[PDB]
Protein backbone atom coordinates (compact mmCIF):
# COMPACT_ATOMS: atom_id res chain seq x y z
CA UNK A 1 0.00 0.00 0.00
CA UNK A 2 2.92 2.38 0.70
CA UNK A 3 6.52 2.88 -0.50
CA UNK A 4 9.26 5.52 -0.36
CA UNK A 5 10.61 5.60 -3.96
CA UNK A 6 9.66 8.41 -6.33
CA UNK A 7 12.66 8.45 -8.61
CA UNK A 8 14.37 5.43 -10.12
CA UNK A 9 17.73 6.31 -11.76
CA UNK A 10 19.70 3.99 -14.05
CA UNK A 11 23.33 5.03 -14.31
CA UNK A 12 25.11 5.03 -17.63
CA UNK A 13 27.85 6.24 -19.90
CA UNK A 14 26.29 7.96 -22.90
CA UNK A 15 26.00 6.76 -26.50
CA UNK A 16 25.93 3.60 -28.65
CA UNK A 17 29.49 2.51 -27.91
CA UNK A 18 28.59 2.22 -24.24
CA UNK A 19 24.96 0.99 -24.45
CA UNK A 20 25.96 -2.68 -23.86
CA UNK A 21 28.97 -2.23 -21.57
CA UNK A 22 28.76 -3.37 -17.98
CA UNK A 23 28.90 0.15 -16.56
CA UNK A 24 25.41 0.65 -18.15
CA UNK A 25 23.68 -2.08 -16.21
CA UNK A 26 21.60 0.43 -14.22
CA UNK A 27 20.18 1.91 -17.43
CA UNK A 28 19.26 -1.54 -18.67
CA UNK A 29 16.85 -1.75 -15.77
CA UNK A 30 15.36 1.66 -16.39
CA UNK A 31 15.17 1.03 -20.20
CA UNK A 32 13.27 -2.21 -19.72
CA UNK A 33 10.90 -0.98 -17.05
CA UNK A 34 10.03 1.92 -19.44
CA UNK A 35 9.51 -0.26 -22.53
CA UNK A 36 7.27 -2.59 -20.56
CA UNK A 37 5.23 0.37 -19.20
CA UNK A 38 5.10 2.13 -22.57
CA UNK A 39 6.91 5.32 -21.69
CA UNK A 40 9.35 6.86 -24.08
CA UNK A 41 12.12 8.86 -22.37
CA UNK A 42 12.53 12.51 -23.19
CA UNK A 43 15.93 14.20 -23.51
CA UNK A 44 15.72 17.17 -21.17
CA UNK A 45 18.96 19.07 -21.17
CA UNK A 46 18.24 20.86 -17.92
CA UNK A 47 18.27 17.46 -16.18
CA UNK A 48 21.35 16.26 -18.14
CA UNK A 49 19.60 13.10 -19.21
CA UNK A 50 16.70 11.09 -20.46
CA UNK A 51 13.67 11.30 -18.22
CA UNK A 52 10.13 9.99 -17.95
CA UNK A 53 7.12 9.43 -15.67
CA UNK A 54 5.37 6.08 -15.09
CA UNK A 55 2.20 4.90 -13.46
CA UNK A 56 2.69 1.55 -11.63
CA UNK A 57 -0.18 0.62 -9.26
CA UNK A 58 -1.58 4.08 -9.84
CA UNK A 59 1.61 5.37 -8.11
CA UNK A 60 3.87 7.89 -9.97
CA UNK A 61 7.42 6.82 -10.69
CA UNK A 62 9.92 9.19 -12.34
CA UNK A 63 12.82 7.53 -14.11
CA UNK A 64 16.08 9.02 -15.28
CA UNK A 65 19.05 7.94 -17.31
CA UNK A 66 21.86 10.50 -17.24
CA UNK A 67 23.64 11.48 -20.40
CA UNK A 68 26.56 12.82 -18.37
CA UNK A 69 29.92 11.25 -17.94
CA UNK A 70 29.41 8.47 -15.42
CA UNK A 71 31.42 10.49 -12.88
CA UNK A 72 29.13 13.50 -13.19
CA UNK A 73 25.92 11.49 -12.78
CA UNK A 74 25.03 13.58 -9.72
CA UNK A 75 24.45 16.65 -11.83
CA UNK A 76 21.46 14.96 -13.42
CA UNK A 77 20.19 13.31 -10.33
CA UNK A 78 20.31 16.47 -8.25
CA UNK A 79 18.95 18.75 -10.95
CA UNK A 80 15.93 16.44 -11.35
CA UNK A 81 15.38 15.53 -7.72
CA UNK A 82 15.56 19.24 -6.77
CA UNK A 83 13.16 20.39 -9.43
CA UNK A 84 10.54 17.82 -8.35
CA UNK A 85 11.48 17.97 -4.66
CA UNK A 86 12.53 14.40 -4.20
CA UNK A 87 14.64 13.71 -1.17
CA UNK A 88 17.55 11.21 -1.40
CA UNK A 89 15.65 8.75 0.77
CA UNK A 90 13.06 8.67 -2.04
CA UNK A 91 15.54 7.96 -4.84
CA UNK A 92 16.65 4.54 -6.02
CA UNK A 93 19.88 4.31 -8.00
CA UNK A 94 20.31 1.21 -10.21
CA UNK A 95 23.93 0.53 -10.90
CA UNK A 96 26.58 -2.06 -11.82
CA UNK A 97 27.96 -3.84 -8.73
CA UNK A 98 31.42 -5.42 -8.82
CA UNK A 99 30.98 -7.28 -5.48
CA UNK A 100 28.27 -9.55 -6.80
CA UNK A 101 28.25 -11.96 -9.69
CA UNK A 102 26.31 -11.89 -12.95
CA UNK A 103 22.79 -13.11 -12.38
CA UNK A 104 22.39 -11.63 -8.94
CA UNK A 105 20.76 -8.33 -7.97
CA UNK A 106 20.16 -6.64 -4.55
CA UNK A 107 18.34 -3.72 -2.96
CA UNK A 108 20.18 -1.73 -0.31
CA UNK A 109 19.69 1.45 1.69
CA UNK A 110 22.80 3.55 2.22
CA UNK A 111 26.52 2.80 2.17
CA UNK A 112 29.51 3.74 0.02
CA UNK A 113 30.39 3.81 -3.65
CA UNK A 114 32.90 0.91 -3.73
CA UNK A 115 34.89 3.07 -6.13
CA UNK A 116 31.86 3.39 -8.44
CA UNK A 117 32.29 6.85 -10.00
CA UNK A 118 28.56 7.52 -10.42
CA UNK A 119 27.72 6.78 -6.83
CA UNK A 120 30.49 8.96 -5.54
CA UNK A 121 29.24 11.96 -7.47
CA UNK A 122 25.66 11.11 -6.56
CA UNK A 123 26.51 11.12 -2.85
CA UNK A 124 28.42 14.31 -3.35
CA UNK A 125 25.85 16.27 -5.39
CA UNK A 126 23.07 15.16 -3.07
CA UNK A 127 24.90 17.17 -0.38
CA UNK A 128 26.92 14.32 0.92
CA UNK A 129 23.94 12.09 1.64
CA UNK A 130 24.41 8.34 1.14
CA UNK A 131 20.88 7.40 2.24
CA UNK A 132 19.46 6.87 -1.22
CA UNK A 133 18.35 3.39 -2.19
CA UNK A 134 20.42 1.34 -4.58
CA UNK A 135 19.65 -1.52 -6.99
CA UNK A 136 22.91 -3.45 -7.17
CA UNK A 137 23.25 -5.50 -10.31
CA UNK A 138 26.09 -7.96 -10.11
CA UNK A 139 28.63 -7.83 -12.92
CA UNK A 140 31.39 -9.81 -11.25
CA UNK A 141 34.84 -8.28 -10.97
CA UNK A 142 38.10 -8.94 -12.90
CA UNK A 143 41.34 -10.53 -11.72
CA UNK A 144 43.19 -7.39 -10.66
CA UNK A 145 42.34 -3.96 -9.19
CA UNK A 146 44.14 -2.34 -12.09
CA UNK A 147 42.00 -4.16 -14.66
CA UNK A 148 38.72 -2.93 -13.14
CA UNK A 149 37.93 0.08 -15.34
CA UNK A 150 38.42 -1.84 -18.61
CA UNK A 151 36.30 -4.71 -17.25
CA UNK A 152 33.54 -2.31 -16.23
CA UNK A 153 33.73 -0.39 -19.53
CA UNK A 154 33.77 -3.61 -21.46
CA UNK A 155 31.09 -5.84 -22.90
CA UNK A 156 30.29 -9.07 -21.13
CA UNK A 157 30.62 -12.25 -23.23
CA UNK A 158 27.38 -13.80 -24.51
CA UNK A 159 26.88 -16.45 -21.79
CA UNK A 160 27.53 -13.98 -19.00
CA UNK A 161 25.17 -11.43 -20.62
CA UNK A 162 22.27 -13.91 -20.41
CA UNK A 163 22.76 -14.05 -16.59
CA UNK A 164 22.83 -10.22 -16.56
CA UNK A 165 19.78 -9.99 -18.83
CA UNK A 166 17.85 -12.31 -16.45
CA UNK A 167 18.85 -10.31 -13.33
CA UNK A 168 17.70 -7.22 -15.15
CA UNK A 169 14.40 -8.87 -15.94
CA UNK A 170 13.81 -10.02 -12.36
CA UNK A 171 14.91 -6.67 -10.93
CA UNK A 172 12.20 -5.07 -13.05
CA UNK A 173 9.56 -7.50 -11.88
CA UNK A 174 10.65 -6.76 -8.33
CA UNK A 175 10.37 -3.03 -8.98
CA UNK A 176 6.75 -3.67 -10.11
CA UNK A 177 6.21 -5.55 -6.79
CA UNK A 178 7.94 -2.82 -4.85
CA UNK A 179 5.20 -0.40 -5.96
CA UNK A 180 2.43 -2.83 -5.18
CA UNK A 181 3.64 -4.56 -1.94
CA UNK A 182 6.40 -2.45 -0.49
CA UNK A 183 10.10 -2.60 -0.06
CA UNK A 184 10.20 -5.63 2.24
CA UNK A 185 8.24 -8.04 -0.02
CA UNK A 186 10.06 -6.73 -3.13
CA UNK A 187 13.29 -7.39 -1.38
CA UNK A 188 12.32 -10.82 -0.08
CA UNK A 189 11.73 -11.98 -3.62
CA UNK A 190 14.76 -10.44 -5.32
CA UNK A 191 17.29 -11.70 -2.85
CA UNK A 192 16.34 -15.40 -3.51
CA UNK A 193 17.10 -14.92 -7.22
CA UNK A 194 20.35 -16.29 -8.67
CA UNK A 195 20.31 -16.54 -12.51
CA UNK A 196 20.45 -20.14 -13.76
The angle that helices 117-125 and 74-84 make with each other, rounded to 10 degrees, is 40
DSSP 157: P
Decide if 174 contacts 104 (C-beta within 8 A). Answer: no
Q: 65 forms bridges with which residues in the sheet?
A: 50
Least Cα distance to 132 among 173, 73, 194 occurs for 73
Q: How far apart are CA 26 and CA 122, in angstroms?
A: 14
Residue 106: which residues within 8 A CB-CB, separation 6 or more? 97, 100, 135, 136, 138, 190, 191
Alpha-carbon span 40 to 42, nearest angstrom? 7
Q: Count of residues for the chain?
A: 196
Structure solved using which method? X-ray
Closest C-alpha among 128, 51, 131, 129 to residue 92: 131
Overall fold of domain 1-196 = Rossmann fold (3.40.50)
Residue 5: name the closest of 129, 108, 102 by CA.
108
Where along the chain do its domains lie? 1-196
Amino acid sequence: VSQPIKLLVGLANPGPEYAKTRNNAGAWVVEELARIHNVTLKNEPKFFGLTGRLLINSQELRVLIPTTFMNLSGKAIAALANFYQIKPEEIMVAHDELDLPPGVAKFKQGGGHGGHNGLKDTISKLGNNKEFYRLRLGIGHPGHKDKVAGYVLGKAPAKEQECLDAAVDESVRCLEILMKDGLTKAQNRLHTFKAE
